[model samples]
Target chain A: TDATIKKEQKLIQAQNLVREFEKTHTVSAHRKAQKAVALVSFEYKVKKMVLQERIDNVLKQGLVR
Target chain B: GSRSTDAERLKHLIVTPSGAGEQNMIGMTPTVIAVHYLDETEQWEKFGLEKRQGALELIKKGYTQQLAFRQPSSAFAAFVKRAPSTWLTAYVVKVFSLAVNLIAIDSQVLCGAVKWLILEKQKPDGVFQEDAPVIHQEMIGGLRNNNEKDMALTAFVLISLQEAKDICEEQVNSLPGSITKAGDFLEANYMNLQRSYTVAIAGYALAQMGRLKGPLLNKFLTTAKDKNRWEDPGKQLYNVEATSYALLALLQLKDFDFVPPVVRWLNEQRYYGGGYGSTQATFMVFQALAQYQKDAP
Candidate 1:
């Protein structure tokens, strides 16, 4: 039986799916940090895999910044 | 429900006549007449409307079906199957009656027509007769006059007839003179210079006349291959007037090997209603392709 179409729950499920898929895909660590910042900002624009590369690039620029 | 009731109420005002007074009895408003004419004209236009007038004009000049006139086998099939019980349908049947023979005997007549057009009809200045009118009313000598667009339309028609002759190897005489004459005409009317739908047709003609080489051939190839190609810019949807002529020109070139792209483009031109058209120009592209492929290897 289907649940009564909870929109918020659907977004959560989508986010979870992206996270799980990214974990297996071996996306870069740089993109992963960008994903973290993006998630905290509540701006879910970049897919999780792309976020991993952004994280790796940021780390290469030094942890202080 | 109200819409349906309104329609039924309006049905009473239709006033179906019992005799020739039908149009008068209907008492159609301008809006109603406009809508009716639009629907009727659109249907007629789809049935090779422009080509009909153009074809007749070419015939009068002794061009014959050998040098000019083209429509897809499918268009003929549709006309044969779906034409209304009117003069138009009867004419389609009469013309297409020899369609099978046309497919068989085309090579011979086409070759001859090209020769005649290239050697005999070509003016000394070589730009085709600048005033060759191709409109239906012009040929029919009717009331309504054609504008510049119509003249442009007729020019393209004459160009198509010229191209048909070129592609079919129809030239004045089997001589070096014929080849020179054909090449001269093509050079004078290069698509990049003229920049009209007629260029594709001329390209096809040049290829058939064995003149698709060096500068002349390259000009044809570039113009035909241009993605920004158009019959008229203000129209919508991709059209095949150029594509068909381009492909036909390429096919007739013999040595220039690029069949895959040409075939792919021709295949994509099929429309939802199972007819072909250039978004702006008149007639179906597929019909021209059928004629092109009819004699090609």
Candidate 2:
């Protein structure tokens, strides 16, 4: 029973870790698209606009890639 | 964390600056020391062995160098824009870099950073400017309000100016008056103002002028008295964040007169479960504790 409890605890901890990582590192599809724009030499405001466009595009792309 | 933690971490990482050998240990982190701590300590502390674990994962992944040297290309700069929790450690790293003069961190950079931050982050009328880049806005706000940006940053800038004052005589002519005006604005408007974040940064400008004393000190003290009664100090949702900046401003007075109130307020801000309520409040407590320990005997 103790070993079973320990195993269950480890499973919970692993699940928690994974969940935390997902929550913390979940790059929005929009954010992922914006990365290319950030790398562009556009002015700050311009970059945001480009980022916006990319975000729109990512919505179209969905998870197909 | 205190300067002592910064020193110890720096030494452990083997990047301990020449003169920073001894200091009191307080809450500190390796992020404050940057990769130089590892680089400097690598030869002595077997740092090479720990490259794949925990904070060193940043080193393994190359985020550490950008943070350490403040390289324009460093991922840490952009990363902080993404992950705000990293800002506290990022700031510690920045302060220690200035302390050791590894990279030329100064008031101008701090001022420029603040001014740029205000211009970039603020609305036309000036407020904390929320939701644009959630992580960047909150973390920058957190650092600015806490006086972490004010103290070391202004001091670093002043030290830089002192070094260059004689040789670059032309720059000095226009500085004192301009700096004074900025300082005056900061002293007049920091507390109870709708836009405390902007004022905190402008306060950093004043602090560099060595003017964060006497009249300016009085101004903050006067503000603190009335500030206690205000319903929402600032960060309306973030518990103690609302008042953390006020406490930080008092801490920067550089005199012992406000220490008790600062200490009392800081202790009062603590909540259960180890978290310090809001991000801003947590940083405020961190900076206040750091200053308290550093300035204390």
Candidate 3:
């Protein structure tokens, strides 16, 4: 199987995914606040369910950049 | 930093809240956002399976679903088989423009929607009216007053049209004239309006058009909560919505000095689920933050 957990690889991929998303999606402290506020109507069953699927994709597919 | 975790968390929330299988305005914004993120990040190409329902493939299902909302008038409405909606159509124009590079959307539909907005709904005085009642008018803040609704509506349309201008250039001949006309209407209204919520969005619209003035900026600056967040005491706009609009305007001006506090205040206002209080606020906050990070040097 091509599936295997690489913690360091996963960490690098995770950090890069965050940056990649942010490239379309920040600042330092104030940027932090903006991200915090933006996250707050996002939850209802469908949204959460869809999110799980996206996470699964991330887990299975891993981050590209 | 906590930023990536926060992004992932917010993204997860947007994922779960997104609607599917029905073409309605409620789910439209979140899908546009989620798809934008997925496409930009090239999530599908990273590790998607040949047939495992990857990121791009999954989000495309929803994005294509939005196409059915295109009405006989070429603009969009909340639900299918309905009359064209001014705000909904404008929103479609903006979102569609925002995602132009990400997916395959129709240029004709895009141009036609702008054409309809300019020629059909926009009045001679350059103000716009909603052809159909928006089901969730509250989701579009600063629209509490019947008399003043047109101002906010125009501002919203102006921003949408601003995005569409480049895409629809020359296709909709009246686009430029209509936008300038609407801008003039808002600039004049800015001299007389007092509704804080309206003012907030108006500031954003003017900033988009590069017509923001010293007094307008000062009004927002003086009204902010300790130079952090903005709120309407009359409650026309929730603090999240008002501050989000205000934050957008500040970002447009590149007023970096005031950016941090507003952003921090917004972060502190987040709900456990990762979005702001309402769908509109959440989307606006994300839009503003996305721009901030893009502009960050």
TM-score of each: 0.37, 0.39, 0.72
Just chain B of model 1: what TM-score?
A: 0.43
- Best-to-worst ranking by lDDT: 3, 2, 1
Per-residue lDDT of B171-226 in model 3, one digit per residue for the tens?
A: 57788899889989998778677666677777888888888877866775777778
Candidate number of the best DockQ:
3
- On the 0 to 100 scale, the lDDT of residue B29 in model 3 is 59
By summed lDDT, which 10 consecutive residues of candidate 3 chain B come out lowest?
B1-10
Q: Higher-TM-score candidate among 2 and 3?
A: 3
Candidate 1 wrong stretches, greater than 4 Å = A1-65, B1-121, B130-132, B137-182, B189-196, B224-238, B255-257, B272-284, B291-297
Docking class of 3: incorrect
| Best first by TM-score, ranked | 3, 2, 1
Better of 1 and 2 by DockQ: 2
Residue-level error in angstroms, candidate 1, position B71:
24
Compose the digit string of candidate 2's lDDT tens values, residues A1-65: 66455444433443343334334432222222322222222123453453344343433333211
Deviation from native of the Cα of residue A8 in model 2, angstroms: 62
